């Protein structure tokens, strides 16, 4: 048995900055493509385009990262029997595109688990992002399981949550995920956040969590699609981090370029 | 008539650093893949793997950057009638993958022109990179024209070249490129270096070049696949930079990750 945990792909809001909505949406709040790193379309959301502010999508290159990981899993014959993700759109889109690369997009149905959402301290304000429900995610051609009953529904998350609460629910939900997949296929994939890789696996392995200051510093090191593997040893039944079955993915930037501001014109 | 000039895609040596060869090659100099941003294979080179040191390939993401641009050109209904590139492998690979996006890889044949190589002061040492000749590039399934007769062959390049020489030969070669494509298709694509966007278009437009320092500082701003367009106004015959027919491409990094070092 193996638990794979990885981070979502490149985020639109990180690339395109504080006012990224202005690069993606017109005066009427309709999506527009102003860069090749943006897709042809984005889902309509119940509260309009500003719902994207606390729940940004991945980029085209975010999609490509996800697909490269899926293809690498396929190429290594790493069979994924179940896939879960955080309700964050970026996590759902990442999971969908791993499935594409895996060529399992018509077989695997992604189980959206609010339990896997990151520490709610990272959310601005006193309300949660307006996550797109699984029924709408499926309507947007993301391979989500609309029949999945989450272990920690949105109703059970609080924005006030302590670090301890975040680690504890991550431990709790990870055990419930493993428990329900037992004897239903060896490999489980979680697609979530930078913080998830340690939060989902720390107490699973019997380890004590770090203090929150060291935790936050560490979490800043997890690249997009950062990928870890936590295996259950048959002999002892103990879970332990091990080398993933795929190579790491590393690439650099392609910076912003305005030809008028740079090339000689006079 | 339009002249499009763009930079090659992401470079393998830039991503993986000074000791990048150690990440791509084994004790016998055979290519090894140790990262998903590395391709499945690299061409066999006459002087072995160290020839890559001064002539690095593009990465997987460099290829994807190239194909995206090609796809955008196809979507914009922009027809590329001729394509030229620097002999740098990164430029050739980028040009090929642009053709892939255009779905023109079996019709267009890339014209490898050493005149489009960048300022030779960016080459370490006193010898040029051991560029892979067109017949070998074709053998590696890159869509290169093995019959193209370059306007500035490798034999004509000087490793010790001055800035003014680089700017002048860029002007010279661009004019000769334009002249031989006249009345045989309206749009020309040049796939080369950061420095080529300006060097190839400056004097073409009748402009005075910047000094070498301001040139270098500007050159540092040009991203991978950075794309400009220089159009010939039909009324006057004056060439001028204009808005490209495709959107720009901007993305961030996905840095290194050692799970042993970072995770509990």
From Swiss-Prot, chain B:
Phosphoprotein among keywords: yes
Spans annotated as Protein tyrosine phosphatase: 1-264
GO molecular function: identical protein binding; phosphoprotein binding; protein tyrosine phosphatase activity; ubiquitin protein ligase binding
GO biological process entries: collagen-activated tyrosine kinase receptor signaling pathway; negative regulation of bone resorption; negative regulation of osteoclast differentiation; negative regulation of platelet aggregation; negative regulation of signal transduction; platelet aggregation; regulation of osteoclast differentiation; regulation of release of sequestered calcium ion into cytosol
UniProtKB keywords: Cytoplasm, Hydrolase, Nucleus, Phosphoprotein, Protein phosphatase, SH3 domain
Residue stretches spanning the membrane: none
UniProt-annotated location(s): Cytoplasm; Nucleus
Domain of life: Eukaryota
GO cellular component: cytoplasm; nucleus
Catalytic residue positions: 7, 8 (tele-phosphohistidine intermediate), 193
Broad class of the protein's primary localization: cytoplasm
Physiological role: Interferes with CBL-mediated down-regulation and degradation of receptor-type tyrosine kinases. Promotes accumulation of activated target receptors, such as T-cell receptors and EGFR, on the cell surface. Exhibits tyrosine phosphatase activity toward several substrates including EGFR, FAK, SYK, and ZAP70. Down-regulates proteins that are dually modified by both protein tyrosine phosphorylation and ubiquitination.
Summary of subunit composition and partner proteins: Homodimer. Interacts with JAK2 (in vitro). Interacts with CBL. Part of a complex containing CBL and activated EGFR. Interacts with ubiquitin and with mono-ubiquitinated proteins. Interacts with ZAP70 (ubiquitinated form).
Name of the molecule in the record: Ubiquitin-associated and SH3 domain-containing protein B
UniProt source species: Homo sapiens
Part of the full-length chain shown: 384 to 647 of 649
């Amino acid at each position: 048995r193996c638990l794979f945990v990885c981070r979502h792909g490149e985020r639109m809001d990180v690339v395109f900055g504080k006012y990224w909505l202005s690069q993606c949406f017109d005066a009427k709040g309709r999506y527009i493509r102003t860069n090749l790193n943006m897709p042809h379309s984005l889902p309509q959301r119940s509260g309009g385009f500003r719902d994207y502010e606390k729940d940004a999508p991945i980029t085209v290159f975010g999609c490509m990262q996800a697909r490269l990981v899926g293809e690498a899993l396929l190429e290594s014959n790493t069979i994924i029997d179940h896939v879960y993700c955080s309700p964050s759109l970026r996590c759902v889109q990442t999971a969908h595109n791993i499935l594409k690369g895996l060529q399992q997009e018509n077989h695997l149905k992604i189980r959206v688990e609010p339990g896997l959402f990151e520490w709610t301290k990272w959310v601005a304000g006193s309300t949660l992002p307006a996550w797109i429900p699984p029924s709408e995610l499926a309507a947007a051609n993301l391979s989500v399981d609309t029949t999945y009953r989450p272990h920690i529904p949105i109703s059970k998350l609080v924005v006030s949550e302590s670090y301890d609460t975040y680690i504890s629910r991550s431990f709790q939900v990870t055990k419930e995920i493993i428990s329900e997949c037992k004897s239903k296929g060896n490999n489980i994939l979680i697609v979530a956040h930078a913080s998830s890789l340690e939060a989902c696996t720390c107490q699973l392995q019997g380890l004590s969590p770090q203090n929150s200051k060291d935790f936050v510093q560490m979490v800043r090191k997890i690249p997009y699609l950062g990928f870890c593997s936590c295996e259950e040893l048959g002999e002892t039944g103990i879970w332990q981090l091990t080398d993933p079955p795929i190579l790491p993915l590393t690439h650099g930037p392609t910076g912003g370029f305005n030809w008028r501001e740079t090339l000689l014109q006079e």
